[PDB]
């Protein structure tokens, strides 16, 4: 234990050159893929706006081509999942987490086409789903492919290139290099045993896919919110409360997404025909809602800067939250392709501003700005549901760029993780892996 | 398979007792670091107060520069040698070992030794950081509360030891995320799985950061303002800068390592000759902290001045060379105080140097040296201590130029790769290996 450690410490941070070069090629492919994917979803959302223009007069006829456009795109999405790759439904992060525990397979030949063209459909229809799900999962498979194609040997090379792909996947989805890495070394890693995930190799992956993102998406940020005000010390306790509020709510949300998975499993009973048709019904509803009140539907990146600025009224906020909770469940819980990561930012922003507003009039002496509380609460639902705060805090920090709010952001984030734990909640990503693994020991 | 399902639902479950004790550690670490930082200033102040009272006679003032630092260095080295030899140098190697259980945490001894010891070496204006002191002190504080409250377990032992060390780095740099990331990048047993509760480390870092902000608000450690952005066709220049740091990273490691050895001969392990040699270096630092202040001191004062492009190319080369020397002499000679900080001040100076050459080489790129300064700042940390993710974030938290993230990473990584391929090793783990092998000899 002493003489072995001296041999170990001098042989620390030693990653084989072959792994590193292959980590670089992974990133590139992940980025381009995510870029192409993101370019697809926009193009499809575009034709969808192009149809509403063609039929702008007849009120109910426009509402039809809103529904049927999303319906047909959702149905095409759900089908590709059910018929060719059932593992690539929902997020895909739980599947990759399992793949790192070796307790799941990585059917790359299958998922890539299914998740890619599948996501394009569900996201393109304006459903309340993220890109991470698709890009993270696709990212992992891309990394698995190059392991297979170049038949590389070992646990290290297998776990590492699976991880770096997953990270370059999140990075390219959020232009957030650090968030991608931190996600892997906060969740993603076997939290029960020591793994040979080369952290330096994850880096090169994330870099390449970030560069690839920046080549095609330069000069325009995903979230622009400008430099908000600072946060005085005597204000911090209000973020602690906000955290506690997220903390009790965090697991309550997890139960709802979990339960809704089951409650929607009855509606179709595992039947492909009834599933796809139910899928188009939700999809259609989202494309319908993406017109009658666009804040309720869609990914949610549009209403983040609008809420932070304090442009919604208190009434309009409460409504948006309630309607988004519903829409977020119906889409993700119903196992459509696409992560729940992004809508969880959009949800926390809306709650953050709600809390900010009440604080502002309660405490005029504090000279508050709800926007600070919106940014604190943005990655808070990620910190109490997914239970990866350090990833949530940095993800926000990388997208909003208000470092001066670091303390409030941590205080809220931690305040969420603590109460989310003490009210018996579980990491929603790990809770789904456990659900699918236990369902496998039940049918077998 | 069946054990994993029991594992997954029992994930992120940290005992409430650990968490409450994590919070109490942070507070203590912060306060301590705060008081420590207020000490160093106070002592550097009297040192300026002496030069005032003897401002006329030129060689007479140069004497009270030397003898002021000498007496404070000698007081420092002594406290280490006489009472706790383990708390010399940085202290981070010691805490890393403590996490592998291959080192003891003599808190009853180190706290007073490192604290009052540091105050001396730092207070005399020696080229040493505060991290060393604060990180080590931080760990001991966390060990103290484990012992005082007699808490049971490996989790409780490893966790409170770690959160203290993180709260230690945080309070030393006003950098909460850097503290955490340091623990979960180095610090952790990189060869077995540990029960370090990540959530508990947070609470510690929070509390010591609040502690820092109560006593030091409205004034930043490094102010540099919003620098320009970095165009994609420019990124390759940061790759080169990284490779330059990559070849140099391990070469520096050798020198700190070798210099430890070559200075061990000067005193031969003898406390009397050690302390006297210690005051000679200390004295030289307090002497240099007037004839050319950029060569001596922690280095935080010359970072903004370099980034702004206020030095000439000549002045830079000089500052680098001089700081290389002064950095070794202080740290290698086992004085209390980390080498973390001077390695920031080293990288900034090299960063600007590279930036300036680039600027005139490529007028079409519309460069600003300051961007290469900030890329190169945490680059030496990434090639010598080999914790890039902590270096990148530490700079990012102190300079606040997020727009330069990609260059900062590309340089950082470019450093870590070439520092690996030229057979270099994590300077913090290389010293632990040194001390452990000297133990079985």
């Amino acid at each position, epitope marked *: 234990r002493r003489r072995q450690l001296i041999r170990q410490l001098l042989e620390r941070d030693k990653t084989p050159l072959a792994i590193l070069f292959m980590a670089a090629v992974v990133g590139t492919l992940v980025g381009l893929a995510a870029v192409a994917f993101d370019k697809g979803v926009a193009w499809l959302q575009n034709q969808r706006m192009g149809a509403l223009v063609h039929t702008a007069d007849n009120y109910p006829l426009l509402l039809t081509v809103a529904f049927l456009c999303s319906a047909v795109l959702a149905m095409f999405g759900y089908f590709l999942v059910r018929k060719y790759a059932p593992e690539a439904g929902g997020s895909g992060i739980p599947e990759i987490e399992g793949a790192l525990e070796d307790q799941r397979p990585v059917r790359w030949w299958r998922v890539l086409p299914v998740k890619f063209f599948g996501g394009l459909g569900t996201l393109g229809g304006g459903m309340v789903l993220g890109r991470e799900g698709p890009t993270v999962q696709i990212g992992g498979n891309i990394g698995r492919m190059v392991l297979d194609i170049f038949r590389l040997k070992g646990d290290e090379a297998r776990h590492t290139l699976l991880a770096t792909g997953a990270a370059a996947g999140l990075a390219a989805a959020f232009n957030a290099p650090l968030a991608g890495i931190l996600f892997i070394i906060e969740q993603m890693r076997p939290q029960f045993r020591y793994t040979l995930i080369s952290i330096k190799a994850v880096f090169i992956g994330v870099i390449m896919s970030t560069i690839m993102y920046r080549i095609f998406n330069h000069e325009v940020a995903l979230i622009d919110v400008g430099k908000l005000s600072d946060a005085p*010390l*005597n204000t911090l306790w209000l973020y602690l409360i906000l955290g506690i509020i997220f903390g009790i709510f965090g697991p309550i949300f997890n139960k709802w997404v979990l339960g809704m998975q089951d409650l929607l499993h009855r509606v179709h009973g595992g039947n492909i025909t009834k599933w796809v048709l139910m899928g188009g019904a939700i999809g259609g509803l989202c494309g319908l809602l993406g017109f009658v009140a666009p804040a309720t539907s869609g990914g949610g990146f549009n209403l983040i800067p609008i809420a932070t600025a304090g442009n919604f009224s208190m009434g309009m906020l409460v409504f948006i939250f309630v309607a988004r909770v519903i829409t977020t469940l119906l889409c993700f819980s119903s196992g459509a392709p696409g992560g729940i990561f992004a809508p969880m930012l959009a949800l926390g922003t809306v709650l953050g501003t709600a809390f900010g507003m009440v604080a502002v009039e309660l405490f*005029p*002496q*504090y*000279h508050l*700005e709800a926007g600070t509380f919106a940014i604190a609460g943005m990655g808070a639902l990620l910190a109490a549901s997914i239970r990866a705060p350090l990833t949530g805090i940095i993800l926000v920090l990388e997208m909003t760029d208000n470092y001066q709010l670091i303390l409030p952001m941590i205080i809220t984030g931690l305040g969420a993780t603590l109460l989310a734990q003490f009210t018996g909640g579980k990491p929603l990503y790990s809770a789904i892996l456990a659900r699918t693994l236990a369902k496998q020991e039940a049918e077998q | 398979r069946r054990q994993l399902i029991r594992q997954l639902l029992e994930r992120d479950k940290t005992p409430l007792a650990i968490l409450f004790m994590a919070a109490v550690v942070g507070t203590l670490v912060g306060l301590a670091a705060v008081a420590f930082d207020k000490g160093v200033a106070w002592l550097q102040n009297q040192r300026m107060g002496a030069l005032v009272h003897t401002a006329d006679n030129y060689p007479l003032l140069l004497t009270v520069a030397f003898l002021c630092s000498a007496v404070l260095a000698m007081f420092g080295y002594f406290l280490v040698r006489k009472y706790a030899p383990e708390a010399g140098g940085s202290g981070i190697p010691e805490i890393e070992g403590a996490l592998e259980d291959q080192r003891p945490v003599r808190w009853w001894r180190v706290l007073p030794v490192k604290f009052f010891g540091g105050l001396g070496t730092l207070g005399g204006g020696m080229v040493l950081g505060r991290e060393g002191p604060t990180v080590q002190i931080g760990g001991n504080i966390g060990r103290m509360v484990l012992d005082i409250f007699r808490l049971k377990g490996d989790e409780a032992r490893h966790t409170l030891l770690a959160t203290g060390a993180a709260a230690g780095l945080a309070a030393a740099f006003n950098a909460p995320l850097a503290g955490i990331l340091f623990i979960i990048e180095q610090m952790r047993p990189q060869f077995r799985y540990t029960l370090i509760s990540i959530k508990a480390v947070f609470i510690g870092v929070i509390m010591s950061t609040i502690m820092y902000r*109560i006593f030091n608000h*409205e004034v930043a450690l490094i102010d540099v303002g919003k620098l320009s952005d970095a165009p994609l066709n420019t990124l390759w220049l940061y790759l080169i800068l990284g490779i330059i740091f990559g070849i140099f990273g391990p070469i520096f490691n050798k020198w700190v390592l070798g210099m430890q050895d070559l200075l061990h001969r000067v005193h031969g392990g003898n406390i009397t000759k050690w302390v006297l040699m210690g005051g000679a270096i200390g004295g030289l630092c307090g002497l240099l902290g007037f004839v050319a202040p950029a060569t001596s001191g922690g280095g935080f004062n010359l970072i903004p001045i370099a980034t702004a492009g206020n030095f000439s190319m000549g002045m830079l080369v000089f500052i680098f060379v001089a700081r290389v020397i002064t950095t070794l002499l202080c740290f290698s000679s086992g004085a209390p105080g980390g080498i973390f900080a001077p390695m920031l001040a080293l990288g900034t100076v090299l960063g600007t140097a590279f930036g300036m050459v680039a600027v005139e080489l490529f007028p079409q790129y519309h460069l600003e040296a300051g961007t290469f300064a900030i890329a190169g700042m945490g680059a030496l940390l990434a090639a010598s201590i080999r914790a890039p993710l902590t270096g990148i974030i530490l700079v990012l938290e102190m300079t606040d130029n997020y727009q330069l993230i990609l260059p900062m990473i590309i340089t950082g990584l470019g450093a870590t790769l070439l520092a690996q391929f030229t057979g270099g090793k994590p300077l913090y783990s290389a010293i632990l290996a040194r001390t452990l092998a000297k133990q079985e000899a």
Partner: antibody, heavy 120, light 107 residues
Framework: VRLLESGGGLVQPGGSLKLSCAAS????????MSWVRQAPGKGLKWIGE????????NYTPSLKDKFIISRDNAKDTLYLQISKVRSEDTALYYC??????????????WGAGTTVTVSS | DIVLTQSPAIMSAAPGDKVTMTCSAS?????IHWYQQKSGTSPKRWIY???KLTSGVPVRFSGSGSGTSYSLTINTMEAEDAATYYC?????????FGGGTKLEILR
């Protein structure tokens, strides 16, 4: 940093006027601005405050339209309209930059002031 | 709103003398601020958050207290200390000032 307010002078009872505080030597945004008036040989009274985005303007317990605070970041200037004036409004008016320490707010820097005289 | 009344309305003291005014609040207040207004000029920020000296104030000044009772003090007065000193709360909205204490050179 300089605060320099004009617009003072003689006004008729039941009149109204528009004082102006023009700022120089700092980013005029980021800062909260405030008016504080001092009745002759008397105490300091708070009139009101306004944030940079002008999305919150607070006045003292004082009836409806009396005071109308506005600012023009583009010109780096702060305004105060006093309406249906009486003799009580006769005072020295300073504008002020707002800041904090722990978060308990203070009136950071002041202009010289303008004297409004209200008499017929 | 919170009322602040200052103790010696007007007072005199010879140079180099312990000078001590009070600022008593109607309700409970935390972290108050002191302002030095000389004759015919801007008020200047003197002491903030119960006790912190402003960037340029000579160290002979000081202040402390809590809850409902706060005070400013001069260990060794000077000539350049004759002015009105105005305390000011903002622990509650709206913010309120004191009536001022006028310090005068005794001779």
């Amino acid at each position: 940093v300089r605060l320099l307010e004009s617009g003072g002078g003689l006004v008729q009872p039941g009149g109204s006027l528009k004082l102006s505080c023009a700022a120089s030597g700092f980013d005029y945004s980021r800062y909260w601005m405030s008016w504080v008036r001092q009745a002759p040989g008397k105490g300091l009274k708070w009139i009101g405050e306004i944030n940079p985005v002008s999305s919150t303007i607070n006045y003292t317990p004082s009836l409806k339209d009396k005071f109308i605070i506005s600012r023009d970041n583009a010109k780096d200037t702060l305004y105060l309209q006093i309406s249906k004036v009486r003799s009580e409004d006769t005072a020295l008016y300073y504008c002020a930059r707002l800041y904090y320490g722990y978060g308990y707010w203070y009136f950071d820097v002041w202009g010289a002031g303008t004297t409004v005289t209200v008499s017929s | 709103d919170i009322v602040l009344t200052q103790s010696p309305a007007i007072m005199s003291a010879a140079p180099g003398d312990k000078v001590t005014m009070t600022c008593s609040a109607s309700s409970s207040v935390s972290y108050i601020h002191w302002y030095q207004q000389k004759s015919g000029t801007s008020p200047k920020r003197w002491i903030y958050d119960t006790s912190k000296l402003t960037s340029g104030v000579p160290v002979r000044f000081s202040g402390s207290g809590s809850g409902t009772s706060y005070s400013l003090t001069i260990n060794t007065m000077e000539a350049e200390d004759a002015a009105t000193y105005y305390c000011q709360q903002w622990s509650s909205h709206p913010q309120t000032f004191g009536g001022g204490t006028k310090l005068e050179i005794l001779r």
